[PDB]
Design a protein around this ligand. Structure first.
Ligand SMILES: [Cl-]
Ligand SMILES: [Cl-]
Length: 303
């Protein structure tokens, strides 16, 4: 799974949404849509319009984005481009972009990895953090990652009926390094390569997470593990040469070509799209548009 395996060591800062009031967050769009598609359901299936087309993605993107802006959070959604060679239905993606345009919520087309683009925007100081369920943006150098941003809330377990609560949680790159006893992001990347990433998802069986971490700490780097006895097992399992894997995380393809704005929603266009084409409740959509205008306004009047 990757860095997620060292969750006991990482331990984020558990917070609430109102603590992120005023923060711009670069949310990985593919990750967000996946959460919406897999968790917003009716009788065990995704929400659908009267023609049978999926709507869970539009539902989440509209109503949860409005909720975030009501807590003072300014989201920007960032979409995957072409993945690197080692690495969602396109209609869902175009639905998403159309919706955000109508809502006035900014988005960016990444040239390759969305999570890398999010991290770059955070490094440049154009957003405060990245927002995803994945830990990838840290490896791409994001100074801050907020997890659970698209799924904050409470539910009952179908089985136990207990109140499961999901809260937003913050991880700061600098603290993650300290928590793991590492010196640099470069070592974090080397560690992640041992554990397995999207570019090498098997990791290195035979090396558990604690062992991986100990190795990186003791020997310093993946490069320096060449002179050791464990190397052949590593070289066997790494699909490509290690430096090319490192380069993907340390020098990801990203773009400068964006300018972040939060515009007024287009009430009538939203109604045409969601209500008339996708069978959303008109009263609910219209009310969401009013809630959104007011929330944007409340952020404007303090700067
Ligand atoms: Cl709602
Ligand atoms: Cl609805």
């Amino acid at each position: 799974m990757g860095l997620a395996e060292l969750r006991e060591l990482i331990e984020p800062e558990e917070t609430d949404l109102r603590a992120l009031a005023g923060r711009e967050i670069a949310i990985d769009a593919f990750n967000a849509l996946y959460q919406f598609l897999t968790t917003i359901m009716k009788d065990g299936r995704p929400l659908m319009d009267s023609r049978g087309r999926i709507t869970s993605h539009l539902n989440g993107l509209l109503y949860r984005t409005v909720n975030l802006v009501e807590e003072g959070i300014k989201p920007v959604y960032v979409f995957d481009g072409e993945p690197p060679d080692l690495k969602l239905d396109e209609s869902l993606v175009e639905d998403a972009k159309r919706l955000l345009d109508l809502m006035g919520i900014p988005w960016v087309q990444a040239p390759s990895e969305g999570e890398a683009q999010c991290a770059y925007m955070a490094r440049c100081g154009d957003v405060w953090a990245t927002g995803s369920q994945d830990y990838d943006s840290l490896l791409f150098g994001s100074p801050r990652l907020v997890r659970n941003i698209t799924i904050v809330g409470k539910r009952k377990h179908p089985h136990t009926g207990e109140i499961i609560e999901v809260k937003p949680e913050i991880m700061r790159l600098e603290d993650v390094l300290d928590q793991l006893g590492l010196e640099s992001r470069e070592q974090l990347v080397d560690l992640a390569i041992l554990l397995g990433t999207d570019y090498n998802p098997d990791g290195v069986p035979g090396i558990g997470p604690k062992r991986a971490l100990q190795l990186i700490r003791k020997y310093g780097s993946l490069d320096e593990l060449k002179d050791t006895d464990i190397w052949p097992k590593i070289e066997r399992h790494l699909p490509v040469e290690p430096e090319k894997l490192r380069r993907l995380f340390l020098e990801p393809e990203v773009t400068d070509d964006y300018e972040l704005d939060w515009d007024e929603p287009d009430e009538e266009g939203l109604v045409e799209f969601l209500v008339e084409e996708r069978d959303f409740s008109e009263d609910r959509v219209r009310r969401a548009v009013e809630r959104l205008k007011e929330a944007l306004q409340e952020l404007r009047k303090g700067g």
